[PDB]
Amino acid sequence: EPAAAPNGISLPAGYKDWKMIGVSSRIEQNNLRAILGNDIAVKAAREGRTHPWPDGAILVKLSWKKSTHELFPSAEVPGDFTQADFMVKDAAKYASTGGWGYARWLGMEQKPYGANADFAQECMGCHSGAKAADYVFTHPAKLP
Amino acid sequence: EPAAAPNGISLPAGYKDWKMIGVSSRIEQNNLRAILGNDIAVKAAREGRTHPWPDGAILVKLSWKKSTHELFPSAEVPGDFTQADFMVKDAAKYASTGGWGYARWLGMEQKPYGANADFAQECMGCHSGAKAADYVFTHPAKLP
Ligand SMILES: [Fe+3]
Ligand SMILES: [Fe+3]
Numbered sequence: 001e002p003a004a005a006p007n008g009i010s011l012p013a014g015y016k017d018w019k020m021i022g023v024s025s026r027i028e029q030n031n032l033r034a035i036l037g038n039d040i041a042v043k044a045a046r047e048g049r050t051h052p053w054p055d056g057a058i059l060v061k062l063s064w065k066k067s068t069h070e071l072f073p074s075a076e077v078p079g080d081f082t083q084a085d086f087m088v089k090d091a092a093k094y095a096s097t098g099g100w101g102y103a104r105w106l107g108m109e110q111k112p113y114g115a116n117a118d119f120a121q122e123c124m125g126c127h128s129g130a131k132a133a134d135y136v137f138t139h140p141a142k143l144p
Numbered sequence: 145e146p147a148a149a150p151n152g153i154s155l156p157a158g159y160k161d162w163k164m165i166g167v168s169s170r171i172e173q174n175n176l177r178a179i180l181g182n183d184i185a186v187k188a189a190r191e192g193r194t195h196p197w198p199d200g201a202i203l204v205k206l207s208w209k210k211s212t213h214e215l216f217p218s219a220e221v222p223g224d225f226t227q228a229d230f231m232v233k234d235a236a237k238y239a240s241t242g243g244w245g246y247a248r249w250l251g252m253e254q255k256p257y258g259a260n261a262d263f264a265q266e267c268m269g270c271h272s273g274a275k276a277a278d279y280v281f282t283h284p285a286k287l288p
Contacts, residue, residue, distance in 0.1 A: 016163075016287050023167045023176045025210075027218040032167050034178065034285075064285055066169075071273055071281060076169040078285040108288050129215050137215060141178075141208055141222040143160050144252045 002110040005103035006117045009088060011110065012038070015060045021045050022141040024061075025076070031063045032078050035138050041089075045140040052099060052134040057089040059136065081108055087136070097124055098135045146254035149247035150261045153232060155254065156182070159204045165189050166285040169210070169220070176222050178206045179282050185233075189284035196243065196278040201233040203280065225252055231280070241268055242279045 002011045018036040025032050037045060041057035044050055063085070064078030088094070088101035102120040104113035113119060127135040146155045162180035169176050181189060185201035188194060207229070208222030232238070232245035246264040248257035257263065271279045 018163075019161050020164055020178055020180065022222055023178050023208075024213075024222075025169050025176060025220040027220065032169060034164055034167050036164065062285075062287065064167075069168075069281060069283075072270075074171040075281065076171060077283065078166060078168075081286050081288070108286070110288050126216075137213060137219070139213075139221065141206075142225045142252070143206065144225065144228075144254050 002105060003112050005105070005112045006114045006119055007101065007103065008117075009086070009101050009103040011084075011103075011105055012058055012060070012086060012088075015058075015084070015086075018042070018060065020141075021059065022138050024138070025066070026063075029063070030066045031082060032066050032076065033064075034062045036060045036062070050134060050136065052091065053089045053136065055090055055092075059087045059138070061085045061138075083107065083113070084110075097121075098127070098131070100127075100135055102127075146249055147256050149249075149256045150258040150263055151245065151247065152261075153230065153245050153247040155228075155247075155249060156202055156204070156230065156232075159202075159228070159230075162186070162204065164285075165203065166282050168205075168282070170207075173207070174210050175207045175226065176210055176220065177208075180204045180206065194278060194280065194284075196235070197233045197280065199234050199236075203231045203282070205229045205282075227251070227257070228254070241265070242271065242275070244271075244279055246271075 019042045022035045038058040063082045065080040067079035069075040091099040094101040102123040163186045166179040182202040207226045210220045211223030213219035228249045230247045235243040238245040246267040274281045
């Protein structure tokens, strides 16, 4: 198993099998991202129960470097896998970080991010800008 | 329930719950895409059984117009849903179109695309360029 994050969160097993919530592309990072969630998160996302998200919801964002497809240069496609970011909802347990447990694992080798157990204050530094939306930027993508 | 495509392919039920294969962004369409697959496709993708893909594999590409996140302008995120494109592998049934059944549904209204039953020749026009990769451009995104 990969090492736990410095705040004690273990890597959610099976996240690559989870359902999609959305996708994104971060210009400044030259990354394509997929956002998945466990079934608690997906149910909440689809039913709009995101104020707050429920206890047990886990979101995962998977980031790859952007490359261009060798056969179709206008298609930006994933190259190198760069990291997996997680938010785990537990209003009581992570009340000090807004009710979410943050954790990041880097690369194929899955090195836990962060110098110490307060690393999540970095995450909060930006995610506080989405405080009105329970610290979550992502808007579930529309589907029929 | 949505009408079948002009070549007789019915919309696959439950595609929104399928596992992810990849993501992409098409620069000339200003979209973001998620590529999902049924469990045959996902197993094939993950094992590298793509030369050729096995019969029964279904790939779906979901497309949204790109929007910029209101709280974070360098984040391109899905706006309106534009289309669902499908490729259904059946080397015998779809031998005339490279072993793949193509189909597209447009919009939230899931209107079948295509003027007639030969609409898939359009798809083949470009997809023939990926013939070395069994007519599939997408490279499964690498995950640990
Ligand atoms: Fe973040
Ligand atoms: Fe295509």
